[PDB]
Design a protein around this nucleic acid. Structure first.
Length: 263
DNA sequence: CGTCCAGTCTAC
DNA sequence: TAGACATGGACGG
């Protein structure tokens, strides 16, 4: 559920739906507590884009589609297990909680938001979440400036391994990326975030917040194969690696000294 | 076999 | 903040 996976899911949606025409209503599973999507069109296309840990999906009526209406945008958050799949209409995956159906005359497929653990959410409207920082993958320069010009914010009092999960400043970084990034630099997880980032402005911490997830995207791995990602990892859950619980109870994997603020 | 572990969101 | 939110598989005692 991290940046690279949201970004590959956007790629997948755009490639799978490039020729497809969808029709009818947007079908939510009965168990899902997310909002019904009030969009219905006789002929519409689906496109996507990702920003940090959010994915914007746009449902665009084709010319002359009925009823006459503007496009509708939704924003998804994947939680721990969210994903998109394109399947035959009659072979729906289990836990397909939101479904878009191709219209005739093509082979009848379904584009599904699949979410086993049901932690993901979707909203109506295209707005990104207002507090989130810029995307480490696609807004690198804005993201770098938003960290550095704000180092006096209380957020950077926390250990660097906890600050990397703060989506106001590291939108797209999650639990495996913070392990892999700190591991490249041999920076102890529980050194203070402000102290680590002041010692700055050999790629540095903020550069690696971009280049490391970019590597995952280049694998096509964690994609929307699973072994090429398992071999790419150097720290997260790897043998020989230490691990501690941060203050919110998430496991930080690291090697060597845990740092001064370790619990 | 029973336990444990695997990003926001909510409410006290 | 602390626990909730929730399914399934690996891992033990």
């Amino acid at each position: 559920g991290e940046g690279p996976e949201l970004h590959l899911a956007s790629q997948f949606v755009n490639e799978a739906c490039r020729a497809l025409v969808f029709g009818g209503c947007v079908e939510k599973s009965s168990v899902s507590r997310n909002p019904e999507v009030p969009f219905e069109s006789s002929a519409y296309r689906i496109s996507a884009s990702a920003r940090g840990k959010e994915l914007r999906l746009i449902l665009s009526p084709l010319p002359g589609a009925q009823p006459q209406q503007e496009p509708l945008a939704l924003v998804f958050r994947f939680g721990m297990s969210g994903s998109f799949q394109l399947v035959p209409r009659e072979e729906l995956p289990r836990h397909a909680h939101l479904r878009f159906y191709t219209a005739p005359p093509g082979p009848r497929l379904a584009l599904c938001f699949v979410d086993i653990r049901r932690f993901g959410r979707w909203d109506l409207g295209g707005k990104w979440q207002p507090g989130r920082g810029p995307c480490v993958l696609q807004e690198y320069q804005q993201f770098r400036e938003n960290v550095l010009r704000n180092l006096a914010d209380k957020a950077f009092d926390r250990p660097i391994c906890e600050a990397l999960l703060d989506q106001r400043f590291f939108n797209g970084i999650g639990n495996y990326l913070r392990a892999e990034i700190l591991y490249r630099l041999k920076i102890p997880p529980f050194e203070k975030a402000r102290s680590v980032l002041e010692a700055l402005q050999n790629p540095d911490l903020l550069e690696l917040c971009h280049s490391v997830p970019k590597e995952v995207v280049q694998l096509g791995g964690k994609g929307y194969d699973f072994a090429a990602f398992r071999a790419w990892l150097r720290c997260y859950g790897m043998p020989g690696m230490s691990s501690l619980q941060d203050r919110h109870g998430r496991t930080i994997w690291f090697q060597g000294d845990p740092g001064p603020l370790a619990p």
